[PDB]
Amino acid sequence: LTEEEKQQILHSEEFLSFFDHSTRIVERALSEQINI
Amino acid sequence: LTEEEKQQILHSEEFLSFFDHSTRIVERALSEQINIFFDYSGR
Amino acid sequence: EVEETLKRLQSQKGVQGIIVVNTEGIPIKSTMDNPTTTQYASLMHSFILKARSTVRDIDPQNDLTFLRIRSKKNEIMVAPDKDYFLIVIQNPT
Amino acid sequence: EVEETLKRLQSQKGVQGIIVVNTEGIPIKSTMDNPTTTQYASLMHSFILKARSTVRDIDPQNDLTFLRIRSKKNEIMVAPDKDYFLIVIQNPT
């Protein structure tokens, strides 16, 4: 709710693999499919 | 009791045209065939 | 000729099961048993009903067109047709 | 680098906003109109709960990985992890 708690949890030792798989799976969704 | 006769609607020629639209979606979707990369996942 | 595409989809890479929803959450065409086809497809019918309710709550003009789920053990695409919907079950590999 | 992630993945076209919601439903990551998209974040929080209930009730061992949705007007995905979740909205571009 507060910026202190967010910058805690963002820089905590939990979001490491979360940011890694976030970037990895969103880049994994970059391959465009077509519908024609 | 779901239906008196399941087969006639599905055996038809125009309800299977909607199924032909659905298999057109199927042919549109199965063409990609790309799998997920590991990048040293471990599990 | 849905049956020839069915026959092509028999030995296709990763095919776990080949069914379809037939009567708006009440499927009939089943290459599997009663739970895996009908009850799981009715569950997913209510779940895509909740998702269409979600996107209709975003914009009532915005309905839904196509769904797909990938997971550990399976990858399932869902094509919502007009009254009945579609379920196709497939391996991830 | 999270803002670098924001820039690099918002530079990907079609995307109207990288609005990523947590497990708490709190807008830990929002770049668009927040009273509008916080409702939708709470929605897709409830429906990520629907999808995780779907996975863990249809199958014991399966884990929900990722979701693919084609709407009428755009192409929206959902990226769940074991602890926290992701939402982003993209157009056909």
Query: Can you give chain D as a three-state secondary structure string?
Result: CHHHHHHHHHCCCCEEECCECCCCCCCCECCCCHHHHHHHHHHHHHHHHHHHHHHHHHCCCCCEEEEEEEECCCEEEECCCCCCCCEEEECCC
Residues of A in contact with B36 (CB under 8 A): 28
Q: Which CATH class is domain D1-93?
A: alpha beta
Q: Which residue of chain A is at minimal alpha-carbon distance from D76?
A: A29
Structural tokens at position C25? 């959450």
* CB within 8 Å: C63 and D43: no
Q: Which chain B residues contact residue C12 at CB under 8 A?
A: 30
- DSSP label of C30: B
Structural method: cryo-EM
Which residues, at least 6 apart from A21, have a Cβ–Cβ distance to it below 8 Å? D79, D81
**What's the CA gap between B30 and C59, in Å, rounded?**
29
Domain that holds residue B7: 1-43
Interchain proximity C86–B2, CB inside 8 Å: no
Counting one residue from B and one from C, how many pairs have CB atoms under 8 Å apart?
44
* CB pair distance less than 8 Å for A28 and B36: yes
Resolution in A: 3.4
In total, how many domains does chain B have?
1
> In the 8-state DSSP scheme, what is residue C64?
E
